[model samples]
Target: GHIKQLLKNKRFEVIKALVESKKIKQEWLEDLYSILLKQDTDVEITQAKYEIIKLLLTEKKYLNFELLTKTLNLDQQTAIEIMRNPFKEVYFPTYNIENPEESRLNKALIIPLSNQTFTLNTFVNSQDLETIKEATNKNFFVIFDNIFSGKSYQLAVAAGLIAKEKEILDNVAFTGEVSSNGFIIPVNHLEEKKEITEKAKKVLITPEDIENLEELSFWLNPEHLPVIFIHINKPELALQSLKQMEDAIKKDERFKYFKLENLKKFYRLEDQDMYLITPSVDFSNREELIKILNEFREKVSKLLTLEGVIKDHNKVVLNISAGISTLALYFGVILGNRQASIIYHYQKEYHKVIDLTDNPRKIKEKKSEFEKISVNKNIQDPLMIIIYLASHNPIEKGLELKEKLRAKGELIIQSKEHQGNLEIGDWSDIVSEIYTAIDDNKQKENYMVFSAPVAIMLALGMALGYFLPIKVFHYNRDEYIEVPIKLNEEILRSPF
Candidate 1:
């Protein structure tokens, strides 16, 4: 009565309606009703539930029970018990490997490709027998290789050394560098390997070292292919790293397996730089080497011009010597002197370099308070105005402007060609613009009124010049001009 009552109840109503609407057929409906009756009677429902779930899981024509169980919050035990029946494996075909040794021995010829390099002549070689056996027994091999660097692996898989996804072999090709420590180093050419993986290919790295395998496990795409790390050390140590890796694989679903192998003896160059450049005894010629050196010299010369000199004398010398390797020492010494001359020239004009002279310290101490006085502000005053007029105007215009501003109580601070206020005015747009605008408007009546502050400032500076001693040291003229008060017999004897 309860079984019949349960079928007519709310929980069964949805099931019953699905059966009546032709969404589910009568056979499945009857099967569900029979399962409900077993559960209602307190009888064991495991066998009944396993049968129904096996049908749902394996029947490709119907909805996938595996996927549906994941979407619905099914208990793990119930889910596994219902869906894990051996009958669910009906979709996969089985393979037999009764005599692996015979299968491998039949195709064991090694084909020579290059000098000391060979390809496995056939896919079913004895080396692949273990893989074939594993494939037949466990559906996949734990380790595999084609013994060729490039596209030969695809051919090997096609020839049945590999279980083809019955699809492309792109997903099957992987390569990694094996270090002596049994670690698998990531290959630099990942893009190339990815192309192989795109065709459902499986790839594996058998590293000679175990330490570098950590990054391999973390970095590899777990879903597409499994990576197995092989540690080739003494048996005991190898087993240790292997056990650790296997434990990790069991705990983390992403990890696959760890293996160990004793690698055979291999030859490699110990001295990387040991190379032979054999010259032809018959055609021995120094002319070609000389020509190469000359070409190299030309290239070096093009890069190291005097204009590229930045800060240090060492850099300047090195730059000059780069072009003339043979005469580099001689030129380097000469360039040092040239560098000194250039520095002196810049110091004399713009004071570009840090002056190490005692006079510089004295000068700095003398002007210590005015050190904070901005050079731009100093240049913008009457000294710069006079230099601007003097450089652009005729001598008469220069004299007229100088006298006019002096009459208005303006002063001149300092002036030198390509130096001081003159240099500042040349480089600075603000100083240049101000002078140009004032000069341009000189004809206007409002010009004097507007320029009165500048004129007065210049006049005051010139007036102060009378009391202040003027010291002029001319490098070009090779002479000195000093105020009469400071002039001695030595000063008077000097040519003006």
Candidate 2:
């Protein structure tokens, strides 16, 4: 009678509905999910599941079960349902290796990184791969990179590499400690590794590094290139900034007129003394911000009439304090004494003096270390970002032009600064927009170019160096035109 009662109602379908909804207990799910092996597929218990999967695939036209489940917005339930039939797999490729040499290959997933392609042979349990696993949403399989030496410090780079390798997350570089839950913790000297980091598209780190960001703008490279400070737990709230530094101090005569803060009263520079001018608080808008900074710069442009007298004897110590000092540093350095040092105070105790002093050392093109990168222009395409900063919004036009020429649909960062010289606040908005762009287009190719105000272009030269090819356009007749900004090294003529 109990058996009759069990069979009296359609309880089996109700149980199946619960399974598809993932309303089942985790303990039961794990017990069911973990142990079902190849031999279990032979049973009559899962015959209906296999048939259902095939039917759904044919009807939905999904390449695999995972995709079919995803199309329905079903997460765990569909995953368990699909797993009920072990015959579905798209990721794993089983080939009959006829060649004897090919047959000797190891059984593991390969992860290709920046310089080191990881041929993972075993499991890495040192810091726990769960964070990495969670980052990939457990959709990817990994054996993990080996690091017997620096264990946790290797986490950031590894994580970035893994993300890129697995999901084509693009060329990202980072330095930090990762928790099992994927929170990026701070490390010792992420700020010091700009040589390696400058080459990467995005530089990643944690919160503690935020307090001591020395030359981070330079290390990140180009006009406000994004420095992704990942906070995986609350990913939407992750901290980010940009790097906008150029090659040398006294470069780009186009900005020579506005050599001080947009004080409307500018300076002329002397080789002997460097001036570190502070900016105003009126960041009313992007245009207003650039107006204030450029007036200051054009005013400073006059001090160049005195360059010969001061250089042999004096060096200026500029204390930078602006609305955004990181942005101002590039503009200020481009307008001053070549043998000068700049001081920017982050906190009261933390002060960084970015020395714009050029040593006349041998054989190099005055660009070294954080001052250069292999940015594409005289290079290839897939150039994903186009940062446009004019006195007005020429971004949408440039965005259209970029695609029309060759590049894919670019992430256009358009900021309106009042033409002429770029102020740090302008830099702030530009870089902030850049930070947003990078976050949005994380998985694209890593080529970035810029078309900004001319003085800011020079400021970018002073900040990121002749490292990347900057795009500058001029109006030939009716429409704006695109031209390659030829910057082989730091360019500043006399009285620059």
Residue-wise C-alpha lDDT for candidate 1, range 103-152, written one tens digit per residue? 11011111111111112122223433333233222221111211122221
TM-score of 2: 0.23
Tally clashing residue pairs in candidate 2.
45
Q: What's model 2's lDDT at 442?
A: 37
TM-score of model 1 (CA atoms): 0.15
Per lDDT, the best of the predicted structures is: 2
Candidate 2 C-alpha lDDT tens digits along 156-197: 433432331222112223445555454555654444443334
Clashes per model (N, Cα, C within 3 A): 22, 45
